[PDB]
Amino acid sequence: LDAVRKRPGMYIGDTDDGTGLHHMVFEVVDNAIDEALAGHCKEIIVTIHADNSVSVQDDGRGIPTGIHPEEGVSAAEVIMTVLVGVSVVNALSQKLELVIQREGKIHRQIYEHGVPQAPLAVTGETEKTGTMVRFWPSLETFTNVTEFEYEILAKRLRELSFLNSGVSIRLRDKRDGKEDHFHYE
Numbered sequence: 001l002d003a004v005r006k007r008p009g010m011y012i013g014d015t016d017d018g019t020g021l022h023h024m025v026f027e028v029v030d031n032a033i034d035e036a037l038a039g040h041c042k043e044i045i046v047t048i049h050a051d052n053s054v055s056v057q058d059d060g061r062g063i064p065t066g067i068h069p070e071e072g073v074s075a076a077e078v079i080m081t082v083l084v085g086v087s088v089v090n091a092l093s094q095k096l097e098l099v100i101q102r103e104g105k106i107h108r109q110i111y112e113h114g115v116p117q118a119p120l121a122v123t124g125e126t127e128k129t130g131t132m133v134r135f136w137p138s139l140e141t142f143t144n145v146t147e148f149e150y151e152i153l154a155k156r157l158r159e160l161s162f163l164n165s166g167v168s169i170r171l172r173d174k175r176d177g178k179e180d181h182f183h184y185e
Ligand SMILES: N#Cc1ccc(O)cc1F
Pocket: 028, 031, 032, 033, 035, 056, 057, 058, 063, 079, 086, 131, 132, 133
């Protein structure tokens, strides 16, 4: 990830005018939609938290957890730490929390500035499947516009709901209780 850390704006977009900040969300949403499309229920939930982190969840199969035979870490960690892709989001997040529900098990992992704090670990059992990422954008990178703007997210998620017409997209703002549900049929 050092190439991204060296020139963040070249990977994510302008880091002073809010452009790059919102692009962080959109990169994560792309992966969540892909995951949701491979499942039965086909819903993603985007939440803006009161600490100005964002989470994206899907109810798909869960991203793969097995050890990548070539890299020697979990496949989820390969996705998060190898090179725009969610690895860029991770590199530019002061914290990122990953939760994967798959094959009867809950898996969790924490990153700080793209560095895993421990290996992906089984933490419990579950009947559900899906993936959730919550990220706190790094305030060492993102300046001036540091808070998410509901309308910027809503506009883009609406476009995505029409293109991905089988996918339900919920947007929730925990700062003021604002919510939308984009679903085309
Ligand atoms: N990477 C990734 C990713 C983030 C959120 C989600 O719901 C699914 C994903 F594959």
